[PDB]
Amino acid sequence: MNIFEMLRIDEGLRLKIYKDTEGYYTIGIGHLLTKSPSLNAAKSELDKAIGRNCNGVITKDEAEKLFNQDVDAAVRGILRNAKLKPVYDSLDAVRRCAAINMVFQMGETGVAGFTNSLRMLQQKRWDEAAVNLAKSRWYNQTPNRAKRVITTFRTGTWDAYK
């Protein structure tokens, strides 16, 4: 297992514009297009991202290239952030995947509210961090996704994905 396989399991693959769990226009492997309610705005964002007139549909190769860009952007965002980088650098490779997964789903700003969880993770207090992570809108709105990610932080294994 690696971060790409983990997120492909969590996000799935759709080659036509769809709505995510919050109602936002998305395509591919969880690529957010826009938070605007306008399908035309989403189609414009898609064409800009791909570099051609897509009319709302992409190929598998295009979806995989967008996904690579999105994972890279999540990693770069962690490494540029003075609050996230020290925690990330303290984690082993499996738990680092759980960190990227959260940033991919919620962004740097979504993970801003997890300050207490981040401190517990840096201190390697895995069970306490797991309970604190679950006391969140994230866990209550996407509980199965959250349970898999939290289990990865708690155990440092891929068991939730096997």
Q: What residues make contact with Cl ion under the rule CB under 5 A? A: 142, 144-145
Nearest residue (CB) to Cl ion, 46 versus 152 = 152
User: Of these residues, 10, 11, 45, 62, which one is catalytic?
Assistant: 11
Minimum CB separation of residue 39 from Cl ion in Å reads 25
- Distance between CA atoms of 21 and 25, rounded to whole angstroms? 10
118 is in an annotated binding site: no
Nearest residue (CB) to Cl ion, 126 versus 139 = 139
What is the side-by-side order of every strand in the sheet holding 25-28? 14-19, 25-28, 31-34
Contact predicate 102/121, CB 8 Å: no
Nearest residue (CB) to Cl ion, 43 versus 145 = 145
- Distance between CA atoms of 122 and 133, rounded to whole angstroms? 14
Known catalytic membership, residue 11: yes
Minimum CB separation of residue 146 from Cl ion in Å reads 7
Known catalytic membership, residue 62: no
User: Of these residues, 20, 64, 108, 128, which one is catalytic?
Assistant: 20
Residue 72 Ramachandran class (φ > 0 left, ψ -120 to 50 alpha, else beta):
alpha
38 is in an annotated binding site: no
- Distance between CA atoms of 79 and 63, rounded to whole angstroms? 25
Binding residues for substrate: 32, 104, 117, 132
Give catalytic residues, as residue numbers.
Answer: 11, 20
